Write a protein that binds this DNA or RNA. Structure first.
Ligand code: O7V
Lengths: 206, 7
RNA sequence: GAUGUCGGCUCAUCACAUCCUGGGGCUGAAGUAGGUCCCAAGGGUAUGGCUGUUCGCCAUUUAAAGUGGUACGCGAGCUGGGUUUAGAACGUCGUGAGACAGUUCGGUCCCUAUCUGCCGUGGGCGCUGGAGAACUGAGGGGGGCUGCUCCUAGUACGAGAGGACCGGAGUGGACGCAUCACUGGUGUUCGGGUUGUCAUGCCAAUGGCACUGCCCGGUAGCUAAAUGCGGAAGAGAUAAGUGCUGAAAGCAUCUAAGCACGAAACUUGCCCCGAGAUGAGUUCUCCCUGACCCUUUAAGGGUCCUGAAGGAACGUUGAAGACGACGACGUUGAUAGGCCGGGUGUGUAAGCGCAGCGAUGCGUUGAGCUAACCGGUACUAAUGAACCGUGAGGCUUAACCUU
RNA sequence: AAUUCCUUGUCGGGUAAGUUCCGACCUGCACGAAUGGCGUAAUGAUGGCCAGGCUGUCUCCACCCGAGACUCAGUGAAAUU
RNA sequence: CACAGGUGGUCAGGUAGAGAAUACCAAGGCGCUUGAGAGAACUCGGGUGAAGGAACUAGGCAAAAUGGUGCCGUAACUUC
RNA sequence: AGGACCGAACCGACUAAUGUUGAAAAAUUAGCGGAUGACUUGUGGCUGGGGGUGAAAGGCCAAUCAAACCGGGAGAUAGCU
């Protein structure tokens, strides 16, 4: 079904009674409020537009204010959408809590990967570095051949921007749900740095 | 002359 | 009036006459395991010893270590052992100079990328009033490997030996994505020890230089050897193949009419880009509701008033970044630095006192110092303005207002 | 064999595995006695081979300090066409 | 070329040291005639490294390692 | 005592990397060799082109050597571009 939007607080460890440590990624899923419900008559598809967090009134523009005022909800730090599973129904202003993940048992987290900037072929594509000696001349960490005896095919593994892109990790175990604190503990590491936004949805693989 | 250019 | 070369390194890509995995027919196929042929190119497809080698032999693995094309792929990408100069010997031929697909030792591989192409990243205009956001997904990429063990079952099979299909569960290798909580690396911006020397007047205490002077530790960050996830199931249409019913041909016949199964291929399902998809889309919201004149009178031109939504610029900046860009903040303010507190690391400072002839030790004292971290704090800097962007948004037609 | 085409000759040793190396056999394609033959301590920036130690040479790269590359201002080339 | 080159002779301080080596200094003389900033790939010149330790490769190329004084002790072979 | 040993100056140039329109028309950096001698070096002098010199490489003789450079024969000749 639909998911929820949160923030990456950081990672810690959870101790069990049997003597096991579970690497968890803490996620602060505050009350997500709906700002727009889309249908097939006006939009062509069924979905909801939600927001979370808060924002400066002196920095929220009037176009955005009118979008929040129409739904009777406070402005947030962004807007995200989720598709409905042909049986779900929501209403504008409805605030969704982390309790939605109380019986899912698994979720697929999505976030913006960290930014490595301009990367090489050894780091980006795990290319094999050439010989550091034995005669190598200025060709220690270079790609080498990029074709044949007259064009470089499309998709050729080269250097370029690495990171700062949308990444999704699948089939993560939900270890704990604390609605009183608006938290969510998922076993394993998720994408992005501390303070980044995370989209949490139930695992679709099942 | 020396083999490869220009060894 | 120059198309540089064997092999190796790196990077690959296509074909199928398929090595493994997958689906089937026959079998002199009992089972296990094999033989042969048909379909199948989605993915996967060894490390080493000797040798310049490819190849090959050998050792040890693997589900398998496929065959070929790509200037016997790839030297404006590397290498230069080999080939392929001048030097020097052996053997051999030659009176000799010298020579030999005979051997042997040694022996300069340059080029700042204009265009194409490719990997990344931006500016401009356009999408027909303008602007700020969320989306639809035409289409395009990525991913698709597999072993072992257990249950099923020591059952079926088989005289025994031996030993399953189907189906299910768990655990691994290789590859890949993300991540830094753990284990660790790095940590010339933290602390300490120590050698030689110079200086701060000197003692003491410090500092500079000697690869960070040489070393032992070590925060953050980055990071793998570290720890989490992933390959799918499912669906649709099929290949070889198996079929049902069924005539032509009173039988028979999988096919001609008709109908149903059928694989890692194909189309979807998962992940990512994505309306420059000029076929330029959809949705929500916000802003502007002036006064005239000239005129070869039109999607016309100019003047005064007006300057919105919003954007840009500037500034403090970022776990964003080559530059642009993207993100946050700008006194109605925690954006950066500083300050406070804590934490972490280093390991008991300095000074004084005590014991000792002294080097030292002890006490004050787990002291002092403490970078990037955590929580707070307007002390400093982020200035009021200005600039860009306008003034209701064409014609035709149709349906509605006035169904 | 600095000489052996056949040939990675054969045997042995060394290695889990040795077309090289060391030691024997002689079947010397095509050794041979001052264009010297066989040995030889010592020497060699000499050639080949095996060990100990050592290490980023490699498995497999990771981080850091600096000089360039990148941006700004100034000066301002080149082959080629 | 205001060019990382080449160019004979003389003078020869201090601490450590065997020393005209080397390190730090004196007298004295210089900072090398473009700078500012950022802190990507890649290149150059360096530092460190988990476990393994030549599996690299034509070849241990390069790098790492060894490194001084004194005493003890020291093989085959040998032209002694 | 020593064409003896280790090792600076000095003289050499074995390896690697860099550089290769270089800082340099052969160098730089890290190592390496000889370092009382067949050593090295300053000044001056001698040997001249089919000749010189050469511990010999076809090596050197003014960044040029299987016959230097300048000038002349000379508008050599070129059945080739
Ligand atoms: C790159 C290039 C021009 C390009 O534009 C065009 C080229 F790429 C084309 C091509 N070249 C080759 C093949 O195709 C080729 O062989 N070479 C190129 C690199 C050097 C090498 C060469 O010539 O090496 C010989 C060497 C003795 C040859 O030895 C032989 O034994 N040759 C031979 C064998 C025969 C056998 C049978 C019948 C006839 C034969 C004739 N000759 C020597 C060193 C010459 C070197 C030289 O002149 N370098 C200059 C470079 C020129």
């Amino acid at each position: 079904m639909i998911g929820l939007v949160g923030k990456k607080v950081g990672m810690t460890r959870i101790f069990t009674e049997d003597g096991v440590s579970i690497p968890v990624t803490v996620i602060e899923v505050e009350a997500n409020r709906v700002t727009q419900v889309k249908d097939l008559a006006n939009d062509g598809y069924r979905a909801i537009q939600v927001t979370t967090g808060a924002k400066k009134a002196n920095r929220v523009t009037k176009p955005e204010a009118g979008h929040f005022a129409k739904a009777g909800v406070e402005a947030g730090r962004g807007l995200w959408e989720f598709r409905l599973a042909e049986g779900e129904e929501f209403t504008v202003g409805q605030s969704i809590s982390v309790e939605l993940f109380a019986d899912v048992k698994k979720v697929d987290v999505t976030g913006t990967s960290k930014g490595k900037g301009f990367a090489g072929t050894v780091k980006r594509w795990n290319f094999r570095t050439q010989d550091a000696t034995h005669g190598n001349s200025l060709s220690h960490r270079v790609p080498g051949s990029i074709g044949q005896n007259g064009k470089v095919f499309k998709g050729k593994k080269m250097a370029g921007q690495m990171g700062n892109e949308r990444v999704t990790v699948q089939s993560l175990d939900v270890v704990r749900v604390d609605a009183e604190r608006n938290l969510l503990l998922v076993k394993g590491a998720v994408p992005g740095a501390t303070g980044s936004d995370l989209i949490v949805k139930p695992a679709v693989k099942a | 002359x020396t083999x490869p250019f220009x060894x």
